[PDB]
Design a protein around this nucleic acid. Structure first.
Ligand SMILES: Nc1nc2c(ncn2[C@@H]2O[C@H](COP(=O)(O)OP(=O)(O)CP(=O)(O)O)[C@@H](O)[C@H]2O)c(=O)[nH]1
Lengths: 426, 176, 23, 132, 37
RNA sequence: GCCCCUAAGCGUGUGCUAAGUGGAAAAGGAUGUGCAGUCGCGAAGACAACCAGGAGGUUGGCUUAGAAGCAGCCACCCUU
């Protein structure tokens, strides 16, 4: 599934824009992705350059400097962030003579490792095609490695043969038609959703979707709220498909909760097809929830990272600033005290702490009171002698006790729109 | 042959005739003639009943013998008492009327749908929403009953259409 | 693969005794 | 008709009375006074052999609280258990299981007539809390 | 009507039969109505 | 090889086959054979029809929108 050997490793921060701290964040992010692929971090260096080197990416001097530590380490895992062009990969491979990592291929092959569903792996294969097609005839282990694209002068003069099209163009047409078929292959999950798309949505089952940064605890929240058994692991991309479950409220209307695939930053943008499963959930969701762990890295950079893609997709899609609730939960046993500054920067602290604290009453409220609504305040007064007059109200809708201390009093309940519109019949 | 070998009782008015392989029967409610298949011998017992026997016990004989033997009994019951299938319509505005020999339904179509009674079948209507078919040939009675029933497609939401007298159609729910 | 499959399976005949040239 | 074993200790339970508060236009209040004419000083633990009438005029008979333990009407608890042979929070013996009113110590079917005293091993210890 | 090479009783109310030389699962629940093809 | 094309044999005996299998294939299913076992069955009434059986504390508790036999939850181990 297009894996790679990591085991030992040493890191380097390219830091071609931003701050040293942000470069360190990116380095640690890619090192965590390396661990996800299976590894063990040793130490990380940093450098400070302007626009990447068009050929060497990291330059001749830094390429040799890193070859030194490469030969010292005697392994092939040296990590360096970024998106490397085919030329840059060629130059770096010629300099190092070993396997160096790039963010795009690392993300892609970790998606391959984590994929378990047919749609997920089809999407990751599409991302593989998208990434590799540029790396054709030019990159390190290329098709035209002095061995491909042979069929040239097949027509000196003319005779009884000849393929026709340009060799490279036909060789690219191979992958082009492959990915054309794969893009045709796009399956409509809307048919799976329709059970709740038109129905329910309109029939009141609102839609709360948990979206956030990877490792943040999206699936953990889903499990805690919905009694589910969804996968929970520290690894990147622990969740592959945006699963969903039920979860009710004091105002009923089971809030179909949905988790997603986390974001980190500067995603490849080629696996937007893979992320469509979660992009569609955000676009069709009426309550977005960000999840932030107690002792999470950085004060707030992951929130900007997720919000960048959120804003991009939602603005391209529709007129929407989908309800976002940046709750701060799972904070107990965070083993940290410098959280008052973040709390004042954004007031919220509702601990569930992987069910250890379980103080999610404030959350269960917000989720809900934000965008819950129905035809509340209906006075279904009824003699209570017919039996039919109590029918369907306490079953479909949800009562709230109200004046209904007995049956011979004012009876009101928050019911669905279809259930009662003039059915009080005094 | 548990009831295959049981004789076919013949009520008084019945008038049976075995012209060899075939079989004709005149009765109060009409006449019916069939032909039991070859690997079977049918005849009349001294006490009026009909006896159907088979030469051997292979699958084909052991099936066809019972088939024909009880089929002749169905025929006798038809000529004597006749078969009547009662059928109720459902739906607000769904009605049936009898245009003499023909039966006209209003099954929510943009036209009233008129079924012409096959030869040997009579239609009755106890109400614009409840009617019945009657005949002597059970096969034909059931077949026309089925045609009337399949007039309108299944409606498992409100159950609008034709149904047999006692029937529990498949009903589902659409909350939207 | 029908052509090759038939050409091969026609070796399973009484006359050929389960063997033919080129399978 | 109507048949229901209500375990409340009171004579105005919400699930039953709601649809029975003023039902049967012929005996909305007639039924109320009919079954509250006497036995009022008594405790309406179960208050339901009421078979059916067009006038609602009959005799009562408190058959028994749950066969698991007949201390529901004696001590006044209103709870039990769910698991088979779970535990026994309630003590009981033959102090009151000798007569237990005039009930039908028989079977639903025309099966047999052995019941009532079957609390020790029969259909009483389904949840566990029974004679100790 | 589920036309599959492999048709089996989905639930206990299903019934396997052969009509016209084909194995069919007929059931009160019409989701379980299957045919071998 | 032997029905005619194409020379005997639309050979003889006993079975199987219902698909043109024969005359192409990896298969789910059993309703064709014979098997060989096996619970109860004996015509000491078996699978079956017509077959009174429908509130035992029978809303049994769980628990409560009712939780009625019946969303669910392991139970109900009992008799002329
Ligand atoms: N100690 C601690 N760990 C947490 C907390 N929240 C999440 N985690 C860690 O995150 C891991 C599960 O990650 P998950 O809930 O899947 O995050 P995610 O947002 O779904 C990222 P992905 O979608 O790629 O799986 C767990 O192993 C857990 O240790 C928290 O509040 N405290």
């Amino acid at each position: 599934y297009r894996q790679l050997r990591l085991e030992r490793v040493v890191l380097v921060g390219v830091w071609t824009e931003g701050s040293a701290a942000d470069a360190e964040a990116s380095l640690a992010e890619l090192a965590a992705l390396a661990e996800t692929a299976g590894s063990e971090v040793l130490e990380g260096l940093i450098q400070r350059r302007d626009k990447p080197d068009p050929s060497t990416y990291i330059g001749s001097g830094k390429a040799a400097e890193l070859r030194e530590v490469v030969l010292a380490t005697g392994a092939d895992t040296v990590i360096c962030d970024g998106e490397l062009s085919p030329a840059q990969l060629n130059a770096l491979e010629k300099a190092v003579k070993v396997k160096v990592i790039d963010r795009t291929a690392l993300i892609l092959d970790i998606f391959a490792q984590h994929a378990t569903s047919r749609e997920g792996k089809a999407q990751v294969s599409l991302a593989q095609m998208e990434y590799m097609l540029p790396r054709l005839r030019g990159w390190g282990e290329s098709m035209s490695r002095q061995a491909g694209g042979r069929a040239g002068g097949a027509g000196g003069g003319v005779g009884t043969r000849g393929p026709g099209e340009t060799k490279i163009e036909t060789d690219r047409r191979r992958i082009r038609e492959r990915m054309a078929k794969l893009r045709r292959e796009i399956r409509d999950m809307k048919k799976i959703r329709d059970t709740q798309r038109g129905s329910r949505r309109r029939s009141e089952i609102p839609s709360v979707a948990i979206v956030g940064y990877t490792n943040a605890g999206k699936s953990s929240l889903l499990n805690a709220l919905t009694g589910a058994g969804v996968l929970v692991e520290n690894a990147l991309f622990a969740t592959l498909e945006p699963t969903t479950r039920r979860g009710e409220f004091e105002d009923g209307r089971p809030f179909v909760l949905t988790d997603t695939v986390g974001f980190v930053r500067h995603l490849p943008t080629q696996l937007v097809e893979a992320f469509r499963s979660t992009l569609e959930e955000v676009v069709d969701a009426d309550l977005l929830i960000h999840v932030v762990d107690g002792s999470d890295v950085n004060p707030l950079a992951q929130i900007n990272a997720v919000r960048t893609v959120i804003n991009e997709v939602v603005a391209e899609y529709d007129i929407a600033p989908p309800p976002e609730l940046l709750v701060v939960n799972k904070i107990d046993a965070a083993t940290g005290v410098g959280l008052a500054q973040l709390r004042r920067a954004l007031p919220d602290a509702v601990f569930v702490s992987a069910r250890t604290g379980d103080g999610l009453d404030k959350l269960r409220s917000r989720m809900g009171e934000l965008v819950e609504s129905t035809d509340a305040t209906v006075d279904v007064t009824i003699p209570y002698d017919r039996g039919d007059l109590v029918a369907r109200v306490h079953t479909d809708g949800h009562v709230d006790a109200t004046e209904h201390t007995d049956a011979g009093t004012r009876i009101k309940a928050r019911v669905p729109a279809p259930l009662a519109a003039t059915l009080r019949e005094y | 042959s548990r009831i295959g070998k049981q004789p076919v009782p013949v009520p008084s008015g019945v008038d049976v005739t075995i012209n060899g392989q075939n079989l004709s029967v005149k009765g109060p409610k009409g006449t019916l003639t069939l032909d039991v298949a070859e690997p079977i011998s049918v005849s009349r017992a001294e006490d009026g009943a009909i006896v159907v026997t088979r030469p051997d016990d292979e699958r084909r004989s052991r099936s066809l013998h019972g088939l024909s033997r009880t089929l002749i009994a169905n025929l006798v019951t038809g000529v004597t008492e006749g078969y009547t299938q009662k059928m109720e319509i459902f739906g607000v505005g769904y009605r049936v009327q009898l245009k003499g020999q023909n039966l006209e339904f209003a099954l929510g179509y943009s036209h009233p749908v008129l079924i012409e009674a096959p030869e040997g079948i009579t239609f009755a209507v106890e109400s614009p929403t409840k009617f019945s078919v009657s005949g002597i040939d059970k096969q034909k009675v059931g077949q026309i009953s089925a045609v009337i029933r399949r007039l309108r497609r299944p409606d498992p939401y409100k159950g609008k259409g034709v149904r047999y007298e006692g029937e529990q159609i498949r009903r589902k729910v659409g909350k939207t | 693969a029908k052509r090759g499959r038939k050409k091969r399976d026609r070796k399973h005949s009484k006359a050929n005794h389960g063997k033919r040239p080129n399978a | 008709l109507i048949k229901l074993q209500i375990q409340a200790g009171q004579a105005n339970p919400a699930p039953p009375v709601g649809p029975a508060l003023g039902q049967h236009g012929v005996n909305i209040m007639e039924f109320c006074k009919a079954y509250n004419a006497a036995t009022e000083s008594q405790r309406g633990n179960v208050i339901v052999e009421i078979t059916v009438y067009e006038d609602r005029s009959f005799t009562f008979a408190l058959k028994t609280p749950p066969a698991a333990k007949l201390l529901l009407k004696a001590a006044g608890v209103q709870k039990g258990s769910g698991e088979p042979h779970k535990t026994k929070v309630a003590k009981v013996t033959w102090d009151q299981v000798r007569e237990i009113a005039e009930t039908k110590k028989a079977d639903l079917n025309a099966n047999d007539i052995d019941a009532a005293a079957k609390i020790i091993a029969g259909t009483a210890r389904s949840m566990g809390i029974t004679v100790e | 009507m589920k036309v599959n090479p492999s048709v089996k009783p989905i639930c206990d109310k299903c019934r396997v039969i052969r009509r016209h030389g084909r194995v069919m699962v007929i059931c009160s629940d019409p989701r379980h109505k299957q045919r071998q093809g």
